[PDB]
Symmetry: D2
Amino acid sequence: MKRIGVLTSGGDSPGMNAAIRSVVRKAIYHGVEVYGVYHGYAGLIAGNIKKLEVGDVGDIIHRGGTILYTARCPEFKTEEGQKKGIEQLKKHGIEGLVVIGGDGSYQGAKKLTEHGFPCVGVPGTIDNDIPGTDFTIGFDTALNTVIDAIDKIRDTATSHERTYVIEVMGRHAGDIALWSGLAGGAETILIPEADYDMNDVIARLKRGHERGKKHSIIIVAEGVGSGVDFGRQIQEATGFETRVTVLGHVQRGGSPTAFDRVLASRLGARAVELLLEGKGGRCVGIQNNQLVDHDIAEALANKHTIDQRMYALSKELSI
Amino acid sequence: MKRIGVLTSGGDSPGMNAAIRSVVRKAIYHGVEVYGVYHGYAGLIAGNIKKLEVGDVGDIIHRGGTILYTARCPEFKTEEGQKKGIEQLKKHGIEGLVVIGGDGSYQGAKKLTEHGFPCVGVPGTIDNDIPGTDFTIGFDTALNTVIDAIDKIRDTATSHERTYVIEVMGRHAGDIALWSGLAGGAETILIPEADYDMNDVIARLKRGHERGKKHSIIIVAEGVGSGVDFGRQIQEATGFETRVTVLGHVQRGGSPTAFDRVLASRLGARAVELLLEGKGGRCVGIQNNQLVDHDIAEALANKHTIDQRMYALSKELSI
Amino acid sequence: MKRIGVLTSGGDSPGMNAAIRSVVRKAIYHGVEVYGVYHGYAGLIAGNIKKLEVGDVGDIIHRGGTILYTARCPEFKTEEGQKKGIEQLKKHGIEGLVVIGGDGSYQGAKKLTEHGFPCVGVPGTIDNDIPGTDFTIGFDTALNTVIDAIDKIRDTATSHERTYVIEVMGRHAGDIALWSGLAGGAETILIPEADYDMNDVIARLKRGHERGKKHSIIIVAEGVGSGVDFGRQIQEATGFETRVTVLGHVQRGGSPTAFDRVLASRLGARAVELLLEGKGGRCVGIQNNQLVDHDIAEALANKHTIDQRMYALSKELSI
Amino acid sequence: MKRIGVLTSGGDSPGMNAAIRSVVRKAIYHGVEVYGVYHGYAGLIAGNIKKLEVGDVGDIIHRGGTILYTARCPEFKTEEGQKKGIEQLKKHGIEGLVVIGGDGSYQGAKKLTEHGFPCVGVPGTIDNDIPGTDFTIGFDTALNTVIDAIDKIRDTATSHERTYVIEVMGRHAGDIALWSGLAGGAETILIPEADYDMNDVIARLKRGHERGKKHSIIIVAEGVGSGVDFGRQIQEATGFETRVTVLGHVQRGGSPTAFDRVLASRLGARAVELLLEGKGGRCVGIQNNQLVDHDIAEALANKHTIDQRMYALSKELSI
């Protein structure tokens, strides 16, 4: 392989620039030229391709976001879309692609390898719901942004303001809510996967108030419901003043923690090793503390699941 | 004075433990005994008073919250409530009191100076709307919590998610929104002291989008309205995906910055100084970079105002 | 059982309060009383044992250090020290003990296990060199503390001050230096387990300066030598102004990150589980992302190793 | 004025990008063209000047360092250096210059104005010793970097490791040590402006140890001496294990706090107004909470002073 490309697709997340750096530096280390593709699959179709040199990934390791930008491109689902993209790859002499992003970025990688363009997928998301990896690049940074908010709520010492509702991200996966709730000492953790009883939530809240819990912290994933309406429901039902924090898109940004930059460096460099040794159609991951790589179609057929032992542990510690 | 008391009241804010510590240590340096009054005015009525030693304020300097707690006391706004407070102060033989808190705790300080009890008021609130001081203890830390959220939102590198609405605290004052917005590069800052046209808000947004401005960040103070409703309305009028963050009670917590710890230290030390030279009925502050002290009643007659030049400057630098 | 005890020993590490919290809450959930032992093995011999209630571990999950304190007990190496240790457990009614700490704390757990006192050892140390676990409680926090300082040094934008030596902890193990340096983009990592050529350190440095590398960050494990001394030799040899940072005990403190609180919570609950099922003389750990428990004497036989692929990859990405 | 230039010189410091951003946006708002001078005075002599558009200062407000770089320039102390400087300025058509940096950059701004080149100096440095301003841009951020290290040291819960020596920057000025020590609760602060007695340091060290003081933190400004040497002597004289942290160049970097971004925004826009309103040869600053502007040569003969009440206050609160 003489010339490869790299691109980021889907929501951006902390650690995409450390994955771009390790892709670019490992490929240049073994004599290969790396072209950055700007604006995901939308810029692949448009021809927004520019050589990357060694020095262009200098000082991006510690930066959030992605310097190659991201964009939604529903035209890449279709056969017309893929042929316009391949024409731009052929025009610049790019023989392989490293694709950093979520589930939808892996669908394009699979379709490109079936049209003769070897591609590897690197899991870039804060949700943790990319199959074939225990941890996605960005998940550890998002947990550290939620627990910063939770620790600051722990300093309040106002007698009549003891009941806090924090709404975190997690439209389909409850990984951010569950690991944050456990790490934050949340009393009630509402995740998409588990069904909850509002009577159980109220009961526990009253039980903690009677034994003098200083703060009662409730975490709601955005996929279950809004914190605001949960907060009005708890105050109405109990008469405890309830404060709501809605973090929103703060969970996506920030300088990456040490675990996401080690992980993005390992995974980005492994994807270049896969392209250099003939393997295309695969996605890298970390499963059982080992660098692993799976065929994309096989990896995408598995479902995301949360650890149920961790969810039961979060209620036992919170009494 | 043989014995003084110290109390915290109103919304807790970062630096209150640094203010309690300089009260304690400054009083003990000059041979005075210091009594902590727990739960604000509510515990003063209750007789929840307790001797504090040198080592009791050790390792609190860098902590958010208040170690003496804060609470609401509706009974202290009546003559009977103020008479029971005095009774407990005379019962412990506390001859003077340092009150740390907002506007509402200043009113109780006033009222106890009228009944023969020397009181000094120390400005502890994150709002910055306490008359007679440029800066309140907790204002600087609450600005750093808000710009931490704004900085994380600036790392998103997604083309379709460009409009961000952040709701900060400050019911009647616009200082947290004005200083946060200037520090974070906000395009539009909505504070209670200025008038906004929704039409000009939209018009700045479209101007910036046309130039290629990467992010459009709108700060909304809570006394203007809700970020949720503004985001809804911005989205509807423009068609731009709008993301809303509501920090809420995160802005009151956290470890105090360097400025809040120095300011609390100086201000609490000055409060003990005034009491030991027989002044009572006063409140300390920092006005024109100098430690100042004012009659509470004359201090509470002034009206809090924001800096129009600084508000003018935030529109010229956000082009 | 009916009564269990918990102790912290060795250098303290962030996450030790989270481990204690999950020890106490997990035993109380199952109906077991938990008694805390102050000052490690010195206070076990001394008699410093006090019952811990549910609310006694409240608001400690997010703090660094350990609330049970830690101490050095030379006496506990002797048979007489062990026999006075068991005297006090038996006088207080304690039938088993959870021990949180390093290498040294595990030896004591072996010795008490061997005299009929069921003990379980929990890995608390910032170093990462406790056999039978991939990660020790405190390791993740210490990595983020070192990368916070390296990120700040990456902002210096002066061209005559491009060479920085950072000296991190790790007497015997180079985990902190290896993970820190891959995560902070260090050019040269000096760890105890790998051999270096000083002249190869000089050649890389020179090479990087020829291409226009902005910074040259060298991480030095404290086991290898002084950062001061290494910085003096780089200046002498190349003539490049060299600046040195010695973090020291900064690396041991701070609020534990999200991974350290999840790891402490899960490992501390696993330790109580083993005591309740009758196992004694075990040490918990996380190996291949799975909770494992090993015999302490079997565990202490292994040698700590660092990943050589991660060391080679660190040299490949810093070109 | 139709075209102005901006340049940063001297050690960099947090908030330099916020001052560059307010220089460029403020000039563009009043229809002026802004050219950036890369590498301080060294790139001024070389003609390393390039136009900056409105969007080239987008996303730098929250970043440390300077995007125009700083470089020592020995040639600009000579008249031909200066005349080459003016030749390049006339060649690009630059009419005025904003110089952001320390004392040394003020020297060149004075000589440029003496050959009829309107220059305004903006105080960028972490040390706080630029005359004419109470606060330099960068000083607030460096104080917060020193208290993050002191805060982490207060978590260690070891009884034999109680005495800690932190060496901070400040060759000629004690501002960083005095404000960090007071904010950190340092027991002994050694700054250039006060005379210390090493017997008085040892006696107050033993007093606190006797009473039960958890920690004994000593701050040493770098201009008084080394932290390592001080550590040796403390342990030699007392016998107490003494741990040293040398922060070094970590104090110059990092994302600027809220006070440094607000200060850089107001000061940099006030520099642009001064050029436009025909007053060159001046330096801006903040004195008694008000934007002031002083002639460069008058400002430069004023001496740097520290508040001695604040120094005395730091020994009174530390008992």
